[PDB]
Amino acid sequence: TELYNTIFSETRKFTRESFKEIEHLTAKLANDRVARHDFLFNNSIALISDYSGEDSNGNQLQATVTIPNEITNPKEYDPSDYPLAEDESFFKQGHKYDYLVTFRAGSLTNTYEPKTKMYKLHAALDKLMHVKQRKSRFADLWRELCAVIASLDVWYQTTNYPLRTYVKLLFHKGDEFPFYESPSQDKIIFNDKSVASILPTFVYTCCQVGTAIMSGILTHVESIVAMNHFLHCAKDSYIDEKLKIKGIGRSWYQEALHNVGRATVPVWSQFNEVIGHRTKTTSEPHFVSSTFISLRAKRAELLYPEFNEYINRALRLSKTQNDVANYYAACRAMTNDGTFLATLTELSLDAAVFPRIEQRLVTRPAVLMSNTRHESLKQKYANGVGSIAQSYLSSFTDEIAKRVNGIHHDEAWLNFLTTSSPGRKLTEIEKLEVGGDVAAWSNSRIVMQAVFAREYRTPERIFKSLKAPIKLVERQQSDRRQRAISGLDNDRLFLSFMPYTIGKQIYDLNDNAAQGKQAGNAFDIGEMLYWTSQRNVLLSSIDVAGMDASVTTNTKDIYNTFVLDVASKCTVPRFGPYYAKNMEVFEVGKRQSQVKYVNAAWQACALEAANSQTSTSYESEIFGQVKNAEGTYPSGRADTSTHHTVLLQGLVRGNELKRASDGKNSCLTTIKILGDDIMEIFQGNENDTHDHAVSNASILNESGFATTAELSQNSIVLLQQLVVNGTFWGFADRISLWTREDTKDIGRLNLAMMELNALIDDLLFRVRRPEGLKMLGFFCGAICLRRFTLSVDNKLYDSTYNNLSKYMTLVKYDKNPDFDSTLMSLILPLAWLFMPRGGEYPAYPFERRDGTFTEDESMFTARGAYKRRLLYDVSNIREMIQQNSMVLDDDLLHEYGFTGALLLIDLNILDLIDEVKKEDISPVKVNELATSLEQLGKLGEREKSRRAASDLKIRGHALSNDIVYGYGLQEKIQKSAMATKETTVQSKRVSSRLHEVIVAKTRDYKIPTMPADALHLYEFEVEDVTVDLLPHAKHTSYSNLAYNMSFGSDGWFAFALLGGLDRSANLLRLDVASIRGNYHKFSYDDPVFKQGYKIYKSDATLLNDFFVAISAGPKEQGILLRAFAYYSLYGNVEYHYVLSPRQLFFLSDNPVSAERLVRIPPSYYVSTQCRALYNIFSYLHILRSITSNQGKRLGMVLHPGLIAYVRG
């Protein structure tokens, strides 16, 4: 009757009775809130105050539950906590609180006359408490708390843990919940007004703290230290106190690692291989031990004194490097609440986007060639930091200038507009001219360009944009400020397109720009893993504090001098509305005017650099229109990241030439830069490496940047990835399973499960217990997302219910709301979670009819069509090949509920919904709009690539339109026209069409089978022979290289068997990723690769037309052909499966690494594709069954029908 007393809680297996029991107990928690209130606040939970247990490293710790008085008895709302200026035009200049202050919920009353300043301030302060706090990822917040508490109960088989008393001592105020969230009003309603204003967020803090316990990061006694620390910050203002101690509670680990003294660590080769292990010293240099003094004093007075004694204990009780790594993982969970930090955008404005002026002022360069209006066409630096940066950068201006000449910049701008982002707002006079449907789609950059295509070559288009304001728009992020961003219109975004195109070319001439976290696996940290394995090396992960605001108007000129140099050496006619022509010009030394030939790239860059207005504007409900001060880099632009990257690498690499011309050597080996992230690695003498690092920091101060120097001997950070002595420390708190930033819970069904699957995958190699991460996600899919609510027409309400009730349980609502249709929830079976095209979640052992169980599927278990095998696996494949039958045992699959689960998948509800939405898109308007965009770039090569697609489709091969480059313009205008929400007339057509398919499918539903399913009929037998471990198993037994890869664990053993990444495969992936613009991460599952590889194997002689259809130039044709040639060594088309790079972070991508572990009889090789096929069968089985792998060799058996399907 209780979740911790179930038999699934003691066996962790799915029998026909354990499964039906957990199914009914979890559906009871998802439907009604009386059961949830009963589950969370039952009187059987005895409150505990004193606790004692082991810390994260096995030492004894004692804690006491402490809830401050300011949370139980909050104060009255003080109106002086949010002051205003004497003009009342904005908030006060220096105001203490940018976030929600802790006060009594009912203490905030709005007793002012409407349309008044103090009325607006209170109508907005009300939205801060009731609207900016409801941020849930999957479901209601009380449902998400039930999911965390259910898993903590089923895992520990008890209820006496400290997190239960926190839940009861915080939210149990009466016989109902203190507050709820109404999805209709999009608001949080308070039932108890005598409650703290900040409590709705602490429901997420409990979710996050319980998530770290399931993860192995925190223990039960450490959950007290963590919850006591969070409640201590909420005494005055939660978010303001957390941001103020975020770094001080984390930067202690470098001192704790120094005191360890020695460490045995793995050693990395240059080619991404662990080649040995060594014992080194972890003592820091003398200039690092000097910062231990100032940091000791800051912790002693700013930190919660119970939290400080945990750090002092972590710092004295650590004996190995694995000790510091475990204590450090806990202090991230103690200082990161897990939520996304949100407030009023007027309150975070001055702290996020206001310009700031650091050490030194940056001076101008000498103008050499000027305009008729005295606007610099060409300049040069006399001295300073501009002279130092250009000494390195001016040596790329000739090679870049010729790469720019070989680009069609008008077609490049049309591909840059792959964004459906707003820009501005249409005008009614303008709106009337286009008419109807078109204006409904104008929230996109590609559609605003199509409407105004008549004036693309008109120069007045530019000047009209200097009259429009830059709309400010902000985003959220965990553990940081709000950081408003600028949204430019298509015209101001155009003036930044040539400075972007120019500075992007230098990425091809250096190796000091980080590609990013493109690969998604350990290939991103491959350089750090190597350089942190060397000796006599100094590691510098230096950070520019608020670079976006620190860039002043004269600092931007250092990049202008670079762009204007390139533009003057190129020959570009007809860029936008510009053309090359003779121009009257002023020169230095000469007294009258000259005449020069200025090309189009020079005219665009020269106009942009001399008309710079960076101030953004936010329209506030309180103050009207609010404008920023001038100077902050807009950061919504084409060249916002290439500017920071080019400016920083010219200062670091130019200081290398400055020191050489002064008689000083450089100890600098590599630098990696991405935006404002810098990573410097010096190797050499101790005083030589310190000398070079100090002058590098001093040249950054001379450029008006403030920065803190965190130098280390044995740790380095880049892009939120910490590497310490050849070991990766993951940041598990940076991933919120329970909160999200966008107020659009995309993924109404079967796509939220893809979002949860993608979030669990990111957590595996940054967590200490991935098996507790599986129990968590299982209960999230069983409680948070198990209902599917849609509105059904009343004339079909009883027909859909009576027909669907035979497979699944449905919920209905009020009979008559006095409307046409009423809404109807749908409760899907638990078996839906583990099914393909459904939940696709790792399963627990199901019980077969003969009494044996299936495999306990791990976190490395593949998805896709591979999940279909579980249907035959519970049907005893082993017994199935003995009888030579291919049958499903439909009776047993019905008891668990797979028949009802697979039926719901066959309705294809989401696909069905999008068909009624595209019926309202008029293709006459999409084609007319696409016709006018084609007159802007290249005059052709859309029809040509479209015809190549159709002349391809006439044969066996038919590409999807998103792949074809000729439909690139349409596919966006479809997205632009489909971005609209569903209307009420469309909900009827959905209900009508959904009703037709239910009476069509539910007649006699049997689980269907294809002939290709014979490939699933294979098994394995355990021999008595122990396979040998790879030699890098000894090298990883000291100081494991991930939190989930400790010695003896399942992630450690999978490395000792399969090995590490395939260096040759990841290299060919980084190439095919750099061929696609506006493309973050490429995987071998991508449509262009999968569709192109399918023809490369079937009909290679048609591969040229494929290249014309996708518009692959000779460079990308070689990059794709080179990857098709390698993937064919191990790839397969017939047996599809899906692994993620974040999932196999350190593990091998190539299935062939598993053929040394399995023995296959040579009589089974009956076809040319058998070898690659059998390598997959064993590669997927060893990753799925890794929890019971004791290191024995396997023998493969095959169904006689599998052999028949392969022969032909």
Partner: protein, 501 residues
Amino acid sequence: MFAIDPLKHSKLYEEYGLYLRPHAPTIRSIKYASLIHSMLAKHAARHNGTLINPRMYADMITLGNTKVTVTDIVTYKALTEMSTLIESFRLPSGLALIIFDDEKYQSLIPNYINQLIAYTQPHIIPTWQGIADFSDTYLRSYFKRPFELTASNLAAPQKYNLSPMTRSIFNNTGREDAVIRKLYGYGEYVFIRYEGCLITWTGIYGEVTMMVNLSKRDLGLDVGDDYLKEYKKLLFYGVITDAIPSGISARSTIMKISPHKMMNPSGGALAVLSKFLEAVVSTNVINATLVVYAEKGAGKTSFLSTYAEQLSLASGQVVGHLSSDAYGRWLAKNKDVEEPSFAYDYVLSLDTDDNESYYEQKASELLISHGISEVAQYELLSVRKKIKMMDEMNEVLIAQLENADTHSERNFYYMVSTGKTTPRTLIVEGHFNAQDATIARTDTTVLLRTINDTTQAMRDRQRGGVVQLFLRDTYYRLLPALHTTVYPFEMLESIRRWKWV
């Protein structure tokens, strides 16, 4: 084929001094291009304002080498129509597309013509001082050819082989067109009309030309007059067309004045200036502020006070105006006061020229620590010695911009703009681009240029001429032209073009 049809907009070309020859192979060609314009505009209107194949259009018109004939039919219906028209011309080549090098001319080109320029090689006619050269091939054959009458040239139209059908008259005699027309027999000739002036002065380095937006009668100046006489009219309406530094100074005299074409204001200027007039007029904006940067010695205070009255009279509201020395003169008095006053009427009373600035006191004692006391000692230094002193003056400026303290620059402008009794409209002047982060939160900052050699107005003055020249060089080194450049005649033109109520 001109980019703007001269048969329709004949008054536009008359502004440049271009009068159509009366009504030949050239008479036939200007009629043909007028038919192509009407056809192109009719075709563009039928697909959302765009031509469907701008490359086929450009090749048929400008090269004359393409024929489209029906023997799909709906996609080439417009190109078949343009084809039979151009066949009927029977030209030996194609019509070249002609453009001027004027910003005003380029702003009036139709949209469909701009779509052709990407697929043609246009013939761009240059302009010297806003006037296209009449010696061009196409300008000589299509329009009348001007004949400039001067004082050493005044004679009957018979002394030269002038015909009223081929020549227009540019009267530069200084006398009325009515006396010239009747006392010398030019009754049948067409005179060109210029509304501006073009003055030539004597400079320190040579001779300086200046274009003024006033008539030679309105501007009361003749040959030999002084630069200081009628100075405010030159400053409000004049733009010097030389490279900076020009040699203009208070010792310049006029060598020559002539009627000239009147200048057009820039488009990027009128856009940023009308972006400021939106905030003045709107009710969704509480405080409006225009920041104006200029070089030290440009004469921006004398102008921006008149600009502020003309804005107050047109908008009907009160306009405040802080000088560029407002903060330094306040800081000189209240640097030791613990709780100084930030009232607008108190700050406004310190903004007089008799109050010394804080930055002038520090640069005075700085120039003494190096031994500089006169302008002649300063001009003798090398560039590296000067730059080494400006770096020490940059340390005095950074200390007032780095934080937001009681006496900081950011707090000063905050407590002044957000005051209860401060005007709603403010015009603040600045010195260098780093004050972007301190002066009021705005969306419109401009850089003002005048007719002034700023280094010459600083060394030809009194009241500490060496500190004034030193600070001019220090600020110049911190103020590039990275914000939109405006002129006094453009800032006054924006007020007139705005529709008040």
